[PDB]
Amino acid sequence: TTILSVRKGDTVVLLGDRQVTLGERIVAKSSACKLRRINDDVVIGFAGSTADAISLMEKLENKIGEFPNQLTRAAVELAKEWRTDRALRRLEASLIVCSAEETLEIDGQGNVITPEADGIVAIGSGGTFAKAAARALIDVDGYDAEKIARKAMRIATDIDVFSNEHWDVEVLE
Amino acid sequence: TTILSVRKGDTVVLLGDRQVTLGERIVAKSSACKLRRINDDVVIGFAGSTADAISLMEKLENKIGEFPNQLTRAAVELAKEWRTDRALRRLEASLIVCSAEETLEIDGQGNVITPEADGIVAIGSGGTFAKAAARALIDVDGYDAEKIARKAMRIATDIDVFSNEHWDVEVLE
Amino acid sequence: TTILSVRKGDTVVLLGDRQVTLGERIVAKSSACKLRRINDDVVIGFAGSTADAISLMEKLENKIGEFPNQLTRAAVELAKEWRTDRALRRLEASLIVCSAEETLEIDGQGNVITPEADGIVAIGSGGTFAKAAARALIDVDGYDAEKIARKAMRIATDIDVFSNEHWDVEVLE
Amino acid sequence: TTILSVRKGDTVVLLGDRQVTLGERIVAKSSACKLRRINDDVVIGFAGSTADAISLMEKLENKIGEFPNQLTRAAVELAKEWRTDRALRRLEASLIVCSAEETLEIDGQGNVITPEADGIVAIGSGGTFAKAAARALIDVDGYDAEKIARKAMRIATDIDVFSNEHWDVEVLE
Amino acid sequence: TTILSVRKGDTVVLLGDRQVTLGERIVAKSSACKLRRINDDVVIGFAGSTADAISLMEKLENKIGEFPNQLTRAAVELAKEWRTDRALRRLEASLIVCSAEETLEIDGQGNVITPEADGIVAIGSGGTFAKAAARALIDVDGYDAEKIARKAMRIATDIDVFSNEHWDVEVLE
Amino acid sequence: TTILSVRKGDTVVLLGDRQVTLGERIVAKSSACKLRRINDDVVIGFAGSTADAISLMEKLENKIGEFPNQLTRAAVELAKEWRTDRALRRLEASLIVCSAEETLEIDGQGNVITPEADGIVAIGSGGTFAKAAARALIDVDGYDAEKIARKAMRIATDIDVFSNEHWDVEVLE
Amino acid sequence: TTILSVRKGDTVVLLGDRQVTLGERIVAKSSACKLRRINDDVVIGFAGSTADAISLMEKLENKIGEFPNQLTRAAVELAKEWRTDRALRRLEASLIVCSAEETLEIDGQGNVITPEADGIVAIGSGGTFAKAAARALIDVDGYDAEKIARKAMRIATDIDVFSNEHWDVEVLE
Amino acid sequence: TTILSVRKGDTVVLLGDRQVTLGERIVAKSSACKLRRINDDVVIGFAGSTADAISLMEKLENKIGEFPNQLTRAAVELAKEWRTDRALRRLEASLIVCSAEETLEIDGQGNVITPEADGIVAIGSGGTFAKAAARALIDVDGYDAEKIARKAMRIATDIDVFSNEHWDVEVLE
Amino acid sequence: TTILSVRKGDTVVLLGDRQVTLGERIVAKSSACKLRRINDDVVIGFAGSTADAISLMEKLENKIGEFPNQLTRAAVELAKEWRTDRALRRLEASLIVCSAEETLEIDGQGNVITPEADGIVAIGSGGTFAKAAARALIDVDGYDAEKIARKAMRIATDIDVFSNEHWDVEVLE
Amino acid sequence: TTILSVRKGDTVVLLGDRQVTLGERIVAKSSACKLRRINDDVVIGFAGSTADAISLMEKLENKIGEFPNQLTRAAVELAKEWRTDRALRRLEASLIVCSAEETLEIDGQGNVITPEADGIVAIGSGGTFAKAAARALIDVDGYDAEKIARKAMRIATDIDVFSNEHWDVEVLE
Amino acid sequence: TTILSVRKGDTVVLLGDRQVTLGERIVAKSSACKLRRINDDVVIGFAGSTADAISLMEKLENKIGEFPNQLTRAAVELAKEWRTDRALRRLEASLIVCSAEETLEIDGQGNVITPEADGIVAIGSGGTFAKAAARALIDVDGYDAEKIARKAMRIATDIDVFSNEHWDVEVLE
Ligand SMILES: [Mg+2]
Ligand SMILES: [Mg+2]
Ligand SMILES: [Mg+2]
Ligand SMILES: [Mg+2]
Ligand SMILES: [Mg+2]
Ligand SMILES: [Mg+2]
Ligand SMILES: [Mg+2]
Ligand SMILES: [Mg+2]
Ligand SMILES: [Mg+2]
Ligand SMILES: [Mg+2]
Ligand SMILES: [Mg+2]
């Protein structure tokens, strides 16, 4: 999987590939969407199984419900619960949560990561390749957020045998 | 095990072999049915033990009871429960769920997989071989769903030492 | 251990050897009975320790109590419980359950296995050898159920270092 | 450890050595008693730690309280509980239970073993050596139960680096 | 694999199935012959890869060349070399060597096994099942060597997921 | 990797993908040719590293040099050497060798495999998927060897994360 | 395996059972001789495969050839070679070497063991049980060497699942 | 991670680096703060994930709430709970707790460590290097607490591949 | 750690070193007291973490509260609880408990060990060295309890890399 | 380590960082050069230890000596030797070999990899990140080879905890 | 072990502790010298066993003999041989080689490390602690090389349970 978010200027994008892999060996679906809206202001992308990811999304919605305009706090509360709940701990996933304003990466080790100044966040087997590629373009004139994101996904997914070339795209802002 | 579903035209079929293997070594039964009807509109096939599969079937019936004509939703709710319930998580199985309209694959990793456009879904040690074979025939003139499914089962079960040549067949639509 | 059941004609037999082995290397008892009656219609043989086997027998009696004339259903319910109960899952055993009418094999993987048409079921380290031997004799004129079972036990228990030549015998139907 | 019981004629003996070993390496006590009376009619010897063994003794007393003159049943009920109780299962021990009439060996695998006709039972790292030695003497004129037991302990404990030459002795029956 | 030899009366047979399995998972060929003649008086069947088996056959021919009418000695010399040669020891195979007069089983553990009085020898994942089945029939009137062998192969190969129903047959003697 | 050969009619084809994967994780080259001609009559494809595959190719050329029109024999001699040479045994590869007349698969387990009647052979992580797909089309009117091979490669390489969509093609015949 | 030697008075006996076990689970031969003469004065019994044991026997003959009337030295030289030769070190076996005068046990750890004053030596899975039994009888009036050895083999082989009741016997010294 | 506290004179400092590392191989954030105030008198630094560390911080706040002016006791009570709570035990973290007066190190092994007279405490992969460096400077004229801490962080974080050069600083007192 | 108790004459001493080691690699504190008084008559030393040891101390105080002048009984009850409580079982520690009259060693294996006649008890990585040294001096004229204990601690802590030369001393008694 | 080569236009650059890491955890040198010239036309960079890398360099010089103007062939011959030589196979390294004309990557798996059309090759823990970054810039106006390489090294070495910011640079062309 | 070298000004020192540890557990000698002169200009310290270290010293003397005033080259040639010689590779050691002019660290991974500008090099379990401490003092007025080295050794050896407080000292330059 490769989920990438680039914020540049008045815009932020989120991309994910669509490959589901079994046994680290075979592609079982090449057209699975890994991004979900949860309102007008917030989208989220996931690496991990449908069930794991969705269970964690729902718990996150509850944390946004409780802390309505502190995205970061909700994220942290989610991570806290995730690490202490026996059930949740049996799940593997990583999430990126995106608003017009903030972007957060949350994993099952309990890290809650915001971008450096460059506005770049990524998860998945392909994520680091994407981050690298994006960073190469972040300060180059003519490259808006989307263009950066697309070129980086191409590069990352070409590299990552566990990610494909078919992407979902969200934009905010 | 090999369970295969092919949807072509106004018809969908589901096939499963009948081999039960112990210790990945020996055949203990060559005549076990791996398909269950649960009403007029829905059949389901399983890879895994009688007990594990059935326990998961029953939880799925409950999810259909609660979400009566959203087969996909029921599947997703099942997967959610399966991944978070301590007990269910100790079970190994995979399911394919078939209606006139939809087909879903659900596993214990929490994946919920629908076919690509070709209408093909399969699980079990033989499943991917069957999917490959079916995809070779999906767009070929003269091959309806049943004929495709039978030829692919022959091929896949000939290859998979854990699947046999005796099949159960369901048809819908 | 070797527990074998052969049904031929209007007769069924159940045999078990009497060896208890420790550490997979030394015989601690050569005279342990591995068969138990639980009413007039039903006997049961076990591979596994006295305690594990009996605990599972008692849970099975309860399942027969709840589903009085569906031996098969009780068996399945037992298997279901066995697979989902944390405690039961820590036990190693396999059972064969015999009535005049039905014979079932239940193991800790959650399989519930009925014989093929040949009426033969067996468990234990020696079970598959016994099954093979019995099958060779099932359709031969002059061999009733008991005679088949005895010859197959000789053969299987000669081969299995974990089974001995001393057998308990039940007859029904 | 070596605990040995020999029943011959109108007499039964129980012996245990007195060595406590740590880390399978060093002797921490050479004068620990491994036998306990629990009334006039019943003694018991243990292999395993003081705490484990005693916890299991107490549960056994309760089983004798409930089944007052079925020593064998109590033993079996104890084994049943031991195997299903999460807590008890974390204990390592083996026990021999002796009355004028019966002798039983119970372990943490859930075996409940009575002697063959020769009246010999043993547990511990040294137990099998002792059994062998005792059996050599069981049918020899001039050797009563005690004499057999002592000679066998000498032999077994000389062999077993985890047992010593200092023994506790009980006689009944 | 299943290679079986039955000697009864003035006749001996050797059978082998034809399944080649990769990764203990998939059938790569269902029509591979596992028997070789090496002159008028001697045939040999193998479990193991073409290359391993043949390399060992050739070394065996050399041992027969050197010890021309002591089949048993040749076998033993082969086993001796096989166990001490670094190269040969990296091979996995088992062989059965058959003449009008003698039958020997040789493996990579260095065992050299001749039949018991019943004239039955077998190797391969299926071998023991076959032996069991054959032994059940060895003393039954009407069953010559071939008939026994065929029925046993059916039974064994039906059981062994790593053996198939297509057999090669040699007869001597 | 996916290397596939289909012989139908007076024609045989050989295809290989071009992906090189490191650490089972990342694509390091997407344009590597895995097929080599060695004269006018013989081509060969490999799964494995450039160095391992080539070393084995050269030893195979020598075997053809020595046994000029027994392709099968050369293959077998190669396999024999490969399995007994200490150095060669440290290599991982699989080969398919193709002439107008014969096709062979050789691996590092020492198997030498010829097609069944359907004329199909394949190796690599994607090979079995390709074989399945090809077999589905082998007897269907309109599908010559090349067309079969291309469709099966699409299917297999779409499935195998370790194979790509860029193929080299040889034809003979 | 159980090989036992008892020296009492002006007599020494050597016994071995005849069971060959594969995979530590099935008996492949119940009639294999584990004793070999090598001249008029010296016999030897082995635990381990025919090939390993014989290879080591032959090296021992050479050591006796070089040190003709120091049985003990030959034994030690053999052990020395066995421990330093790469090839020999890959073999599993233990030997007992018997003359009218001396008895030695040699293993693959490089121990060379002579009896205590009681004249008893034993190897194999069953060896220590046999030693224990023999020691119980060594000093009892009426038991000559053979009688002791036979009773101890019964006892040890009854206990050892890897030894049987069929014995070869040599007498000297 | 490197968290360091140096107390010298009427001043104490606490430093932490800002690197978050994934998979022990890649830096995911170089600007994460690892220090938290919890009132006017007490700050705390952590090695471990945001979620684990914060969960443990909150439990510590509760312990300070219950034992208001025994920092050391709270620390010990926290450690006690941490070691006995199933959930907490699944977390990896280490903490340093600092007041004007006391400094404590608490880890998941249940150690509660106060500085030696030199006033130095440190945790993390880099902690022991920092301790070593600080100790070299503790008694040297001209080096106040901050200066010592800064130089030791440079040194330790230069060495530790899992710590970076960007530090957060607290001073008390 | 090294905790040692020597009782000689009308005096008993208890000593412990002060080293705390992390990761079996580094000294984190060289001045940690490992002895605690709990009233006028009883002191106790521990090997293990502050938290584990203290938790177990407190449970021991409760056992003394309940069995006020049976120190041995309290110890045994503690051990019983410790071995059956899920939480306590996750702790590693060993204790020595000392009164004017009795001395006991308790570990997490559930052993409860009293001295031999020589009045010596010790725990920790250095404990057995200390016991050896003390036993060498126990019967030598001029050496009272304290002098013995000090010399043995020197010797043992010089040897044990996990114990240091700084000791806490208690005397009774 | 990060070694990167970018060829763009009539220029090629080769960069390597200078960090040497021990135990995958501490930096032992931050100023080690990982590039070596070997004549006027050819430079080479290495990941791996000085000794391993240099040993392999010297063998490569010999291969260039033997195949003077086929850089690619030398590389392949080196890889061949490296994979078959027992000694060389014990070394861990990867190399990049650069001339004005060709660039090759050689590893210990025996891969020999040339760049895609983009002219980019990289090895080391950081290599794939550098490749990703370089690829993002390869086709952008204003970025010559050096500028691309420098920016990609910054990015990759920022990410790779096993690479640093200090680089050696060669230019050809 | 801790071997440390500090070069400052016109002077270089080399120190080593004297502790030999067995089984990572016990000190077997506290007075072993780990430094050797090999002429007037060169000393060397080692971590590792006497035999390993000395064998490697001798090979190094030969390399200095061959490259008389290129200390660095000799070191590199030694490392080269060490990594390719089968025998040498079975040794564990690390060395520091010191002259008036150069200092080199050589290990069994094949690294050859010279100091950074600060002139500090160290090996052994304690080495990194020493390096850290030394670096803290390197630029501080009043601290010559020896004084730095001594203070760092104190600190490092106090930390490292595998190093002691007794040091050997050489001075040059
Ligand atoms: Mg890809
Ligand atoms: Mg099949
Ligand atoms: Mg048997
Ligand atoms: Mg002893
Ligand atoms: Mg089969
Ligand atoms: Mg693919
Ligand atoms: Mg036996
Ligand atoms: Mg750093
Ligand atoms: Mg010490
Ligand atoms: Mg870095
Ligand atoms: Mg120290």
Coordinates of N, CA, C and O and ligand atoms in Angstrom, one line a residue, chain B residues 17 19 154-165, chain E residues 19 25 27 161, ligand 2:
Chain B
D17 N -15.1 -27.9 -3.8 CA -14.7 -29.3 -3.8 C -15.1 -29.9 -2.5 O -15.7 -29.2 -1.7
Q19 N -13.0 -32.1 -0.4 CA -11.9 -32.7 0.3 C -11.6 -32.1 1.6 O -11.5 -30.9 1.7
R154 N -11.7 -28.0 -12.6 CA -10.9 -29.2 -13.0 C -9.4 -28.8 -12.9 O -8.6 -29.5 -12.3
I155 N -9.1 -27.6 -13.4 CA -7.7 -27.2 -13.6 C -7.1 -27.0 -12.2 O -6.1 -27.5 -11.9
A156 N -7.8 -26.2 -11.4 CA -7.3 -25.8 -10.1 C -7.2 -27.0 -9.2 O -6.3 -27.2 -8.5
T157 N -8.3 -27.8 -9.1 CA -8.2 -29.0 -8.3 C -7.2 -30.1 -8.7 O -6.7 -30.8 -7.9
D158 N -7.0 -30.1 -10.0 CA -5.9 -31.0 -10.5 C -4.5 -30.6 -10.0 O -3.6 -31.4 -9.8
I159 N -4.4 -29.2 -9.8 CA -3.2 -28.7 -9.3 C -3.0 -28.7 -7.8 O -1.9 -29.0 -7.3
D160 N -4.1 -28.4 -7.1 CA -4.0 -28.3 -5.7 C -4.2 -29.6 -5.0 O -5.2 -30.3 -5.2
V161 N -3.1 -30.0 -4.3 CA -3.2 -31.4 -3.7 C -4.2 -31.3 -2.6 O -4.6 -32.3 -2.1
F162 N -4.6 -30.1 -2.2 CA -5.6 -30.0 -1.1 C -7.1 -29.9 -1.5 O -7.9 -29.6 -0.7
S163 N -7.3 -30.1 -2.8 CA -8.6 -30.1 -3.3 C -8.8 -31.3 -4.2 O -7.8 -31.7 -4.9
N164 N -10.1 -31.7 -4.3 CA -10.4 -32.9 -5.1 C -11.3 -32.6 -6.3 O -11.7 -31.5 -6.5
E165 N -11.7 -33.7 -7.0 CA -12.4 -33.5 -8.3 C -13.9 -33.7 -8.1 O -14.7 -33.7 -9.0
Chain E
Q19 N 2.8 -38.9 -9.4 CA 2.7 -37.5 -9.0 C 4.0 -36.8 -8.6 O 4.6 -37.3 -7.7
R25 N 2.7 -28.6 -2.1 CA 1.6 -27.7 -2.3 C 0.9 -28.0 -3.6 O -0.3 -28.2 -3.7
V27 N 0.8 -29.9 -7.6 CA 1.2 -31.0 -8.5 C 1.8 -30.3 -9.7 O 1.2 -29.6 -10.4
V161 N -2.3 -37.1 0.0 CA -2.5 -36.0 -0.9 C -1.2 -35.9 -1.8 O -1.3 -35.3 -2.8
Ligands
MG2 MG -5.7 -32.5 -6.3

